[PDB]
Amino acid sequence: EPEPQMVLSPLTSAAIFLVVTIDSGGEDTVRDLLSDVASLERAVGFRAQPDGRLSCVTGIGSEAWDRLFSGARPAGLHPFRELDGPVHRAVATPGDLLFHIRASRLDLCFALATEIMGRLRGAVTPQDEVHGFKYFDERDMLGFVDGTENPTGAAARRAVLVGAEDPAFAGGSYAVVQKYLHDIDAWEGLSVEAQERVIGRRKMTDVELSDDVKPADSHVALTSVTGPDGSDLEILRDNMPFGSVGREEFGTYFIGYARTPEVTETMLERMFLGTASAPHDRILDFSTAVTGSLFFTPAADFLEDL
Amino acid sequence: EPEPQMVLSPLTSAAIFLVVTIDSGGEDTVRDLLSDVASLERAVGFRAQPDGRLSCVTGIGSEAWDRLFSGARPAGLHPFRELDGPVHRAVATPGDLLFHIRASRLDLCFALATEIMGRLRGAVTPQDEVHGFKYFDERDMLGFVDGTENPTGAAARRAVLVGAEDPAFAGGSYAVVQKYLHDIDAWEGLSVEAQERVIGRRKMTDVELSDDVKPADSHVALTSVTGPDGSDLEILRDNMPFGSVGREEFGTYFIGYARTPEVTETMLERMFLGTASAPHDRILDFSTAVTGSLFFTPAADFLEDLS
Amino acid sequence: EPEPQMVLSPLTSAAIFLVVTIDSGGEDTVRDLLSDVASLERAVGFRAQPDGRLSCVTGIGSEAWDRLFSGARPAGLHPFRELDGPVHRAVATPGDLLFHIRASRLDLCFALATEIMGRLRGAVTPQDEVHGFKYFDERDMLGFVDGTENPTGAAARRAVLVGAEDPAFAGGSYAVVQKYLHDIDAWEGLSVEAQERVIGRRKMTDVELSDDVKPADSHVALTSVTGPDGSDLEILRDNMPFGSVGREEFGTYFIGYARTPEVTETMLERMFLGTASAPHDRILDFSTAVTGSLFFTPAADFLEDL
Amino acid sequence: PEPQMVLSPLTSAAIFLVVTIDSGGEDTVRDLLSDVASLERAVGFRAQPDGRLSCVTGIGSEAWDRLFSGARPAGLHPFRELDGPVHRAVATPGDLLFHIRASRLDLCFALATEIMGRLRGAVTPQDEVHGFKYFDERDMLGFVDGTENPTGAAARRAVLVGAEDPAFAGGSYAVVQKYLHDIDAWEGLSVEAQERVIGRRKMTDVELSDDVKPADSHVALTSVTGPDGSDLEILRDNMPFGSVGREEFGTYFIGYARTPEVTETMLERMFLGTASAPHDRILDFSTAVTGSLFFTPAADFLEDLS
Amino acid sequence: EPEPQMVLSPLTSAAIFLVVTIDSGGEDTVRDLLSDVASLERAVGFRAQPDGRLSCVTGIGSEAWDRLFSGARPAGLHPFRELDGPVHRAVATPGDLLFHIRASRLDLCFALATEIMGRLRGAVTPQDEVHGFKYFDERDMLGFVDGTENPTGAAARRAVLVGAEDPAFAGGSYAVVQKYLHDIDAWEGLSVEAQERVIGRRKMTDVELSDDVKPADSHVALTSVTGPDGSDLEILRDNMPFGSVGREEFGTYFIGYARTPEVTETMLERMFLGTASAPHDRILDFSTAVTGSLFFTPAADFLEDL
Amino acid sequence: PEPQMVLSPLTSAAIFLVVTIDSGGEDTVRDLLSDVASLERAVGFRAQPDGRLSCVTGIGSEAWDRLFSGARPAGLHPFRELDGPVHRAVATPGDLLFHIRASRLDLCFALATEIMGRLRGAVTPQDEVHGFKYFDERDMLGFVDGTENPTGAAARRAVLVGAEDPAFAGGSYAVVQKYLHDIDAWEGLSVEAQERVIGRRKMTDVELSDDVKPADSHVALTSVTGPDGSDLEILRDNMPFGSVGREEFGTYFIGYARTPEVTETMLERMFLGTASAPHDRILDFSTAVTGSLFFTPAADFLEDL
Ligand code: HEM
Ligand code: HEM
Ligand code: HEM
Ligand code: HEM
């Protein structure tokens, strides 16, 4: 019975996202970091029992995997597929390792990040670093409650964790990350009612719009995906707001976990390429992806056997 | 199937450790209590839900077991084995009943302890009583984070709970207790770096030392045990600080839980007797054990059925 | 595999109890809501993660069930049985739908209640609405700690959830509600020791009286029932104080969950009708039931599949 | 002299209790008034330091002459009924006001119990409201309520009677109105329209610019400059309350001021209007069902009733 | 006007009381500590801003004062007066320095006590050390809420702080300490109503007994003292429960602050010697004093200039 | 004379915002200044219980003359650059300071959004820092930071402008410096060596005895007795900030005082040193990147625009 990383953990009030690439000859340094990552996690985490809720999820990219490990590959691991839509593009950017660090306070996140990057100095190049913060009652930079429909319990376990379809990597998951910057000026130009028709939910109360009123080009409509089975295909999102007031940056840092990248990729295609009913997701008219990467987050015990 | 006691429950900010012996003719009263202990826990505990976190783990010693129950004995149940090392000594002291009381508040611990002792008045003799308190960011009296490498989840479950190896006592655990008093004067005479080498971890940050910087006689080295399997042998520790400023008492109350005492004893033998590589555990140069007892903590439904 | 409602979750500091009857023609509106109740819960509840502890348990009465659905019914689903004792009486009052709404904050309960009633407006008539609040250290309005002997963990699941004895409704539960009013004047006429003999537990410390001192007509003695096989018959209770000072109204809202109504009813019967050694439960000399209803709380998946 | 907790901040729970003194009740009421502070401590000390239990006792105009023989507060008179063209501010009976606040309802209820237990047979209850915090300090209209309350020294100058009436220094005047809202009508308005009624942004609580702020907006009409140029200010401890089944969604208004003239001017502008505005637009969705004026003496006035 | 020590500070959930005698020739070491004690307080305390609430009050005994300082003495400073009543006795025990350490956490108290004693090592002998803890809803070991009638605000200031009557020591206070052990067995043999007549207040509710039911030999009767002008003489109490279950020690650590010892001593005389109306205080029938010391707690700036 | 929230304690989160006023932006700025308190209330009241939202507004010396006519605060001047032998205290541009504090970063960010939203196209951002509490009130050097801050009346007397400048009573002077730390170098030192640099014990925060404390320790050099004989004090609201990837581990220094002379004397002893000390030893591990001086007026001053 394999132990997964904290991919099922709930959202926290603080987060750090680290994306790095592995320099020439950096493999060895990276390998024995990976073996110590859980150790470093407890070293910092235990200081803030019991309300700390510190966790680190480590992801490894497609290219990076081959450099680090001989043997089998996760069945679904590949580079993030750039999507060049008629209007909006989902860019792909470099990234070998992901560190998704969460806690109830930023100090814990920062302390852990410091230890991780301290061990990696001279072996990696930083691509992206984001300090996410909770924004009021679980809102995003668009002013909407964000994460409502995340699966819970058994439903989440079956949606997120690799199982018998790839037995060797069971307990693992696939993370997709995209850094989105928002055009607040354009968004603020819309009425609340217009904004609601973009998302597919009521702004203040977070109640889902009726099927009668919900536009087919609304975010909720596009990202509702039914399989050939007839079952709802779900991902687990741990999105965090970030930004800088002076540089006029108001951002959503998207991260989605699923047992297969196909699920996430299908949703991305519907958003960026569109469907029969919608040219594209209307949220992208106010959101611009600036990064895009895909990582496999292995079971905890896989990392510990290095 | 069987329901364990709160032996897996996490560390709290307040604790009471109570160790008593059973007087001759006190058996009836003791059994009578043991069957009511869980209901006493609820009586006090329910008042302070949801953030009370009151729990009581009840342990029974080897000698006490024979006096108390006729029937099968837990396989690993034996009295604490005293260790006479060349320098340091792990003493064995009397103790028939263990009450490990934890809560987020001392009052809850005190109230429960009062109800238990009220019932045991003329049947038990108190041997030890410690009031434990959280010290800053989970520090011990030596100034180091304490409990870091405790197992969690399924790993904790395998390491602590008696399973199929002893079916009639499935859900049980073994608790070894030792009250240590520290020589703070000698300790604060060392530099931080020297203190780190004694422990095997950085002081401020709690980051484990590199394997080729970590001495063979450091606490972490000697308490790192690998079995014939190749797997790590783990115990679950609920150490609490305690002490009196006026009496120059600065202490660590040691309590380790494991599915078999053989694990704790191996670690204990390595600390006191040493290995090929190490004479003894350097931590013992600033720590004196003044008590030493071993208890079996039965599954909850074992206590309840005593009736 | 069937997912239950939050019937096993603990006491919270705030609760709203809502009982309604379905107006003629309201059936369709009611069915549509039942399928969205879980969705409304998440919508409101997610805003207050993770300290919110918002839950809703929906129950359906015997007569309501026959109006809403066709096919098989839960084995034990019947209207509340009136108990006409020599002295005290347990009355049966109308109620088709129970909404048991709990949270750590009243605002959360009220918001959810608003959303539910908003969608039921003109289809249902309200029968009872009670806003419960925690009173000191889990005390009821009689000044005694209330809920101590509730089952926990496995025993709770055993006592509360329908299993193999009614396989088509596994994961369901039966909820009996009764609104009690206390005569505080009469109660305060008693000494503490006398009140203790009524309940069967110490007032301040909540320690149970020993078997020699505990009277046969005490509340604890009468509600202690062993089955034919010697096993204890248990229910899960989520009682909440309520009241109005100006009206001199001091109440306990009784709600008890059990896998079969036979367990709860045996307790009612012993209370109101008495035993061989007790004419009735002494607590009833200071407590008057002004409502009485029985509901079946289906498994969650039952509701969403409407 | 020592004032009552009239400057004390808003809490998450409140009980408002308004009663009339029955004939022959004067002596029982006088006894209570002397003990009210000690009852407040008896209950309150149990929940230090996060209890924040306080009780402000107010006395009506008619009640004052019945109770006291000496001088009267200069500003004390019965609430003036305002009969405007469209909207009416009713004057309703009320001799004593108990404004009870704490961080938890149980504390409020406990104190109210003790107070009414002593007043039974001497007083008749007129009104009882149990108020609760609603999200981020919102009212039932969904707007942040209390923003412009004076703080620090400004509050002291606005609320506390001073040298203008030296024998009652440390006192204050409290106006209470119970408002019920028409939530159906209100939710028929767009957010932008609702903002026009109130005079501030809904979600962000930012005041509308002076160029866009309607003259009949709530904020416009309750902004009153004195003949000296500076703004008249009152301290508002409004609480939401209600009952879902009965479609009762309410704001319990209570305003403190060093003279009623301030509060009455403000009320006149709302009900009667200015040259540029017929009446307050908030009143198109809000109906006042009670109206009472009370003087809240300095604490030492109450206890020196020995 | 000088800075007082935290003698007006509220009750906390944790406390360490530390009483020592100064060894022969240990005066210089003591003087050095006294001048650094505020630094030590801030050194430890700042780590737990802002919920730590760490404070230290330093008291100096009568005999110790002469050994430490030359010149003026506080007017009311003398050794504790032993009271040998007919039945009960208040013993005088040695004490030169008192450290009254409070915080919301024991760890902060222990840390500070460590630093203090670390400096005093070899210059003092410890006489008494007690670790106090909050017991439920501000209760003592007798099960009664303890500290209800403590003065607050300007009343506390007037009752506690030395003023113009001794201007050289303005801002100082006098502390009386007594360690009491309770006979819980005997006390738990009384009915609640008997216990109430001993204390003079209701047990659960903490409401004071009316003046026609309250016995003359009750605690509240004998400790209620009216002064020349007819107003109550008051002290500030920071009582903390303590004890050891094994040794059957259930204790109250009594500490009372007053601007003059004469107030506390009057109360003690009434309690121990009795009046014409009362043989002695009934609380003494269940409580034995084992220590008894009197200290002057000088203004903070007195300690600093040393 | 109602002052700004300058006597207010440390919070878990902070945003420091320094801007320059673009040419012809005077009017827009003056208008914001009159509304800043109402914007603070608008956001702050939402979390009324325990939000602890505050905003202190500061105005630079050159900015003052562009905005207001008449009386100038006596001690208001541009930040004096100090070019020492080894270390340099740089002066950088800054017209407006917004010192925003709350118990939550969201509150800070929202207020900053509203402030900056109103100032768009009238100001140029110079610096933005998101500060966060680090464990038990520690800085990036691992030391408890702010211990010897004055409290109560001592704080009020040390920080608030009084009779010496009656036109601006209830004001204060704020000095800001963004420091970056050489963590590699710092963590090479032993704890004992670190303690000699600071002048206090690392873990316990206990001050070293006067006989073991080096003359070039931070604590020794910043301890200044005035010509009057009493200790000179400032109120520090230092916050850690940083970025792990960039290798940025910083202390945002902000100190409030009745007169800038007090703060400047300390700076002088740190960068230039004394007879017995070359410079503050903390500076061998700390580089100042910004340096600005602002006057923070009384609250009522801002309202009467
Ligand atoms: C003198 C009293 C003791 C003190 C102050 C002490 C303190 C510590 C500290 C600071 C650590 C490192 C942090 C952690 O992982 O918890 C540690 C680790 C540990 N201690 Fe102790 N300890 C004491 C006695 C014991 C005893 C008697 C045992 C059992 C025989 C024990 C077993 C362990 C184990 C198993 C670890 C984890 C080692 C690892 O896997 O890294 N300790 N202890
Ligand atoms: C008048 C309203 C009622 C009040 C105020 C009340 C109060 C209490 C109290 C104080 C206790 C002891 C503490 C505990 O909860 O374990 C108790 C126990 C209990 N009550 Fe009630 N009760 C009421 C009505 C009922 C009803 C109607 C039932 C069943 C239909 C019931 C079933 C129980 C059960 C099963 C126990 C646990 C007995 C045990 O095993 O010790 N109660 N109740
Ligand atoms: C119908 C019930 C009422 C509701 C729901 C209500 C709601 C509000 C709201 C949302 C605000 C703006 C935010 C704030 O500053 O608090 C406000 C402001 C205010 N209200 Fe009301 N209000 C009501 C009745 C009254 C009454 C009866 C008075 C006095 C007679 C009053 C006096 C004020 C004042 C003075 C302000 C602040 C004006 C300023 O910006 O300077 N309100 N109220
Ligand atoms: C044996 C240890 C003691 C216990 C358990 C105890 C307990 C109590 C209790 C329960 C109260 C009523 C609630 C309150 O206002 O605090 C009280 C009141 C009081 N006690 Fe004590 N007390 C003790 C010793 C003393 C001593 C030695 C003194 C005086 C030297 C004292 C002075 C007072 C005073 C002045 C009051 C307030 C009476 C009033 O004005 O209503 N107590 N105490």
DSSP string over C205-254: T-PBPPTTTS-TTSHHHHS-EE-TTSPEE--EE--EEEEETTTTEEEEEE
CA distance E110 to E128: 15
CA distance F104 to A105: 10
Q: Which chains touch C (3 or more CB pairs under 8 A)?
A: A, B, D, E
Structure tokens at F268: 């002088």
CB nearest to D244's CB, from C117, C135, C248: C117
CA distance E118 to B187: 14
CA distance B233 to D17: 65
Q: Identify the nearest ligand to the CA of C283 by its number.
A: 2
Q: Is the CB of D276 under 6 A from ligand 3?
A: no
Q: Is the CB of C242 under 6 A from ligand 2?
A: no
Q: Which of B187, C178, B248 shows the shortest CA–CA distance to E124?
A: B248
Mutate to test the pocket of ligand 4, among E223, E231, E238 (most ligand atoms within 8 A of CB): E223
CA distance F221 to F228: 18
Q: Which of residues 179-218 of F touch B (CB under 8 A)?
A: 190-192, 202-203
Q: What residues in F contact A16, CB-CB < 8 Å?
A: 244
Tracing tokens 């053989």 back to the chain, one arrives at B262
CA distance F198 to F204: 13
CB nearest to C206's CB, from B3, B46, B50: B46
Q: State the nearest Cα–Cα gap between A107 and chain F, in angstroms.
A: 5
Q: Identify the nearest ligand to the CA of B266 by its number.
A: 1
Q: What residues in D contact E210, CB-CB < 8 Å?
A: none
CA angle C199, C204, C206 (to 5 degrees): 55
The residues, any chain, with a CB within 8 Å of residue E220's CB and separated by 6 or more, are E199, E200, E201, E208, E209, E214
Alpha helices in F128-259 (DSSP H): 152-159, 183-186, 191-198, 218-222
Q: Does C145 touch chain D (CB under 8 A)?
A: no
Count other Cβ atoms within 10 Å, centred on residue D146.
18
CA distance F51 to F102: 6
CA distance E269 to E222: 9
Q: Which residues pair with B126 in a beta bridge?
A: B20
Burial bucket for residue D229 (CB in 10 Å: 0-12, 13-18, 19+): exposed
Q: What residues in F contact B203, CB-CB < 8 Å?
A: 191, 203
Are chains C and F touching, using the cut-off of 8 Å on CB pairs and a minimum of 3 such pairs?
Answer: no
Q: Is the CB of B201 under 6 A from ligand 1?
A: yes
Structure tokens at C81: 């049985």
Q: Which atom of ligand 3 is nearest to the CA of D200?
A: 12
CA distance D238 to A188: 31
Q: What residues in F contact B204, CB-CB < 8 Å?
A: 142, 191, 202-203
Question: Crossing angle for the helix pair A106-120 and A27-34, nearest 10 degrees?
Answer: 140
Count of CB pairs separated by less than 8 Å, A with D: 19
Whether F106 sits inside 8 A of A135 (CB atoms) is: yes
ω before D73 within 30° of 0 (cis)? no
Task: Look at residue F1 and give its three-state secondary structure.
Answer: coil
Count of CB pairs separated by less than 8 Å, E with F: 33
CA distance D106 to A241: 38
Q: Which of F201, F220, F194 shows the shortest CA–CA distance to F279?
A: F220
CA distance B75 to B59: 15
Q: Which residues pair with C158 in a beta bridge?
A: none
Q: State the nearest Cα–Cα gap between E299 and chain D, in angstroms.
A: 26
What are the distances in angstroms from CA A197 to CA A218, B143, C44, E150? 6, 57, 19, 60
Residue B40 phi, psi (nearest 5):
-65, -35
Structure tokens at F179: 């420091």
Give me the active site residues of F, please: 145
CA angle B258, B263, B264 (to 5 degrees): 75
CA distance B208 to B196: 9
State which amino acid sits at residue B98: L
Q: Which of C285, C272, C125, C299 shows the shortest CA–CA distance to C195?
A: C285
The number of residues making up chain C comes to 306
Q: How many CA atoms lie within 13 A of B213 on its CB side?
A: 12
State which amino acid sits at residue E18: L
CB nearest to C47's CB, from A145, A154, A208: A145
CA distance C182 to C248: 10
Mutate to test the pocket of ligand 1, among B81, B91, B146 (most ligand atoms within 8 A of CB): B146
Nearest CA to ligand 2 atom 4: C252
The residues, any chain, with a CB within 8 Å of residue E78's CB and separated by 6 or more, are E62, E261, E294
Under a CB-based contact definition with an 8 Å cutoff, are residues F16 and F96 in contact? no
Q: CA nearest E147 in D: which residue?
A: D45
Q: Is the CB of D219 under 6 A from ligand 3?
A: yes
Tracing tokens 């409004």 back to the chain, one arrives at D238
CA of B223 to the centre of ligand 1 (A): 7
What are the distances in angstroms from CA B94 to CA B64, B114, C24? 10, 22, 76
ω before E50 within 30° of 0 (cis)? yes
CA of D256 to the centre of ligand 3 (A): 13
CA distance E303 to E169: 12
The residues, any chain, with a CB within 8 Å of residue D130's CB and separated by 6 or more, are C131, D13, D14, D15, D105, D108, D241
Residue F91 phi, psi (nearest 5):
-110, 125
CA of D222 to the centre of ligand 3 (A): 7
CB nearest to E129's CB, from B20, B117, B246: B246
CA of A245 to the centre of ligand 4 (A): 57
Q: State the nearest Cα–Cα gap between C292 and chain E, in angstroms.
A: 32
Q: How many CA atoms lie within 13 A of F73 on its CB side?
A: 31
Under a CB-based contact definition with an 8 Å cutoff, are residues A304 and A35 in contact? yes
Query: Which of F101, F201, F205, F237 would best serve as a mutation to test chain E binding (most E beta carbons within 10 A)?
Result: F205
Q: Is the CB of C183 under 6 A from ligand 2?
A: no
Whether B136 sits inside 8 A of F135 (CB atoms) is: no
Whether B42 sits inside 8 A of C149 (CB atoms) is: yes
Q: Which of B237, B227, B258, B267 shows the shortest CA–CA distance to B160?
A: B258
Q: Which chains touch F (3 or more CB pairs under 8 A)?
A: A, B, D, E
Report CA Rg, chain D: 19
CA of A48 to the centre of ligand 3 (A): 43
CB nearest to E148's CB, from D2, D41, D114: D41
Nearest CA to ligand 1 atom 36: B223
The number of residues making up chain D comes to 306
Q: CA nearest D147 in F: which residue?
A: F45
State which amino acid sits at residue D260: P
Q: Is the CB of C267 under 6 A from ligand 2?
A: yes
State which amino acid sits at residue A250: F
Compute CA C88 distance to the chain's CA centroid, rounded to the nearest angstrom. 20
Q: How many CA atoms lie within 13 A of F111 on its CB side?
A: 35
CB nearest to A1's CB, from B149, B154, B207: B154
CA distance D187 to E252: 59
Q: CA nearest A134 in C: which residue?
A: C49
Give me the active site residues of A, please: 146
Q: Which of B41, B243, B66, B54 shows the shortest CA–CA distance to B140?
A: B243
CA distance A163 to A170: 5
Burial bucket for residue C146 (CB in 10 Å: 0-12, 13-18, 19+): buried
Residue F121 phi, psi (nearest 5):
80, 10
Expressed in Å, this structure's resolution amounts to 2.4
Mutate to test the pocket of ligand 3, among D177, D253, D279 (most ligand atoms within 8 A of CB): D253
Structure tokens at A290: 């600036």
CA of E147 to the centre of ligand 4 (A): 7
Structure tokens at B300: 């909850």
Q: Which atom of ligand 4 is nearest to the CA of E178?
A: 27
Nearest CA to ligand 4 atom 34: E223
Q: What residues in B contact E16, CB-CB < 8 Å?
A: 245
